[PDB]
Design a protein around this ligand. Structure first.
Ligand SMILES: N[C@@H](CCCC[NH3+])C(=O)O
Ligand SMILES: CC(C)[C@H](N)C(=O)O
Ligand SMILES: [Ca+2]
Ligand SMILES: [Ca+2]
Ligand SMILES: [Ca+2]
Ligand SMILES: [Ca+2]
Ligand SMILES: [Kr]
Ligand SMILES: [Kr]
Ligand SMILES: [Kr]
Ligand SMILES: [Kr]
Ligand SMILES: [Kr]
Ligand SMILES: [Kr]
Ligand SMILES: [Kr]
Ligand SMILES: [Kr]
Ligand SMILES: [Zn+2]
Length: 316
């Protein structure tokens, strides 16, 4: 909508207060004009017609419980935009500041979130498996990273290329969580998953096996459910990325950690310059090795650690 840029205030899903960029024209809208072509947040009103209505509020205060998922979808899309711009010189998901659109209150008791090819969509959860999923910054950034992948490598969402697609979203979802630096970790979705259970998450990058996901190529799922295991076999790549950053010894193979920033640079370069729609795990290893070589040199510690990490998870 055409209007003047304003700053509202509200509370997110977890009860934290934050300021949000809004737009005023009779109503205050969740329309952030400060980032690219805009960040826009919509109300799906418990239905599945998308995007729904651009979020309108009478007084620029967003403290109602119904407001909370919108506040966080809006705010964390902003954080994610800032991450890609400041850390990777990427302007929104298409690199040309495409508008970022999100819808909240999708369906009823919907225990998921997704990128639908055009926008982000967040369920409210059923209150037992999930609370509203935009409450997790790693979730928001995971979903927006699917948009980045779709505009860059274009990894096909099945089998090994799909597992890489998923892992890329977990990796950068996690790196955005560290960037915002509010109790960050190497777990996925812990802030919105099972409110009645402390200390768990949907997936773990540090130990995928904790939730039954493979941490080695020899343990890969080869069946047909979950598009050939895209959320399952992602654990193999998530573990490799974790090892590259943090180091460790895994099935007897020791990896020297090189830290999160370099992990991010190596994988962002692989994603945008080397991976293709059909890339498999072996081809990811090659892309990561060549990316690290480009950035740090063929005899660098960084290249050695990438190789160690993929060795550790049995890839090549
Ligand atoms: N996002 C993952 C986990 C969601 C679990 C929903 N109960 C998937 O779609 O497989
Ligand atoms: C959380 C949710 C996400 N789309 C899975 O994984
Ligand atoms: Ca209000
Ligand atoms: Ca956290
Ligand atoms: Ca996390
Ligand atoms: Ca929990
Ligand atoms: Kr703001
Ligand atoms: Kr944007
Ligand atoms: Kr949209
Ligand atoms: Kr982005
Ligand atoms: Kr996620
Ligand atoms: Kr939760
Ligand atoms: Kr497994
Ligand atoms: Kr795999
Ligand atoms: Zn995903």
């Amino acid at each position: 909508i055409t209007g003047t840029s304003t700053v509202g205030v509200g509370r997110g899903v977890l009860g934290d207060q934050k300021n949000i960029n809004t737009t005023y024209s009779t109503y205050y809208y969740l329309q952030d004009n400060t980032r690219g072509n805009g960040i826009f947040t919509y109300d799906a009103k418990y239905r599945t017609t998308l995007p729904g209505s651009l979020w309108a509020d009478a007084d620029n205060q967003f403290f109602a419980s119904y407001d909370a998922p919108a506040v966080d979808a809006h705010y964390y899309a902003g954080v994610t935009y800032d991450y890609y711009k400041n850390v990777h010189n990427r302007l929104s998901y298409d690199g040309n500041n495409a508008a970022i659109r999100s819808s909240v209150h999708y369906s009823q008791g919907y225990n998921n979130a997704f990128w639908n090819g055009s926008q982000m969509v967040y369920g409210d959860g059923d209150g037992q498996t999930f609370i509203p999923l935009s409450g997790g910054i790693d979730v928001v950034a995971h979903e927006l990273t699917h948009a980045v992948t779709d505009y860059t490598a274009g990894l096909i969402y099945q089998n090994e290329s799909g597992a890489i697609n998923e892992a890329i979203s977990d990796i950068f979802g996690t790196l955005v969580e560290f960037y915002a630096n509010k109790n960050p970790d190497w777990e996925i979705g812990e802030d919105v998953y099972t409110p009645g259970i402390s200390g768990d998450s949907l997936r773990s990058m540090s130990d995928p096996a904790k939730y039954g996901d493979p941490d080695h190529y020899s343990k890969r799922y080869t069946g047909t459910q979950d598009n050939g295991g895209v959320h399952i076999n992602s654990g193999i790549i998530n573990k490799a990325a974790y090892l590259i950053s943090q180091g460790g010894t895994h099935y007897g193979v020791s990896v020297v950690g090189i830290g999160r920033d370099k992990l991010g640079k190596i994988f962002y370069r692989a994603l945008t310059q080397y991976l293709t729609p059909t890339s498999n795990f072996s081809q990811l290893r090659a892309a990561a090795v060549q990316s690290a070589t480009d950035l740090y040199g063929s005899t660098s510690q960084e290249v050695a650690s990438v190789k160690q990490a993929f060795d550790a998870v049995g890839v090549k």
